[PDB]
């Protein structure tokens, strides 16, 4: 409806996209917490147990 | 002289009425924009009250 600038929308869209990138940063950093097995095969013995 | 000045103020006040009708048009359009910017959520109700005043 052109009740606000065309630059003031672009700045808000950029802030949206880079805070979405910060959420994806924190989501990848929290997905690294669950130690997903990077490969498929026979898994050996746990070199460290729970609590370490 | 009096008929000349009376016709002259008549025509000048025709022009004054036309310009204030244009200012009423621009204020009504600014109030339409501010009412949309309030119904969406960006501007508060205080900016809507400056638009109404």
| For A3, nearest residue in chain B (alpha carbons) | B33
Q: Do B36 and A3 touch (CB under 8 A)?
A: yes
Three-state DSSP state, B9: helix
The structure tokens listed for A17 are 């996209």
B33/A2 Cβ within 8 A: yes
In angstroms, what separates the C-alpha of B12 from chain A's closest C-alpha?
34
Structure determination method: cryo-EM
Helix ranges restricted to H, B2-42: 2-40
The three-class DSSP label of residue B43 is: coil
Mind giving me the DSSP string for A1-52? --SS-SHHHHHHHHHHHHHHHHHHHHHHHHHTTS---SS-S-----SS-TT-
CA distances from A5 to A24, B31, B39 (A): 29, 17, 18
Give the closest-approach CA distance of B19 to chain A in angstroms: 24
């Amino acid at each position: 409806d052109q009740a606000v600038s065309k630059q003031q929308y672009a700045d808000a869209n950029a802030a949206y996209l880079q805070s979405k990138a910060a959420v994806e940063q924190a989501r990848i950093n929290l997905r690294y917490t669950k130690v997903l097995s990077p490969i498929s095969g026979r898994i050996g013995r746990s070199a460290v147990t729970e609590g370490a | 002289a009096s008929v000349a000045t009376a016709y002259l103020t008549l025509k000048a006040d025709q022009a004054q009425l036309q310009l204030t009708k244009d200012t009423l048009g621009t204020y009504q359009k600014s109030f339409d924009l501010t009412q949309r910017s309030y119904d969406v959520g960006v501007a508060s109700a205080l900016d809507l009250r400056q638009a109404q005043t």
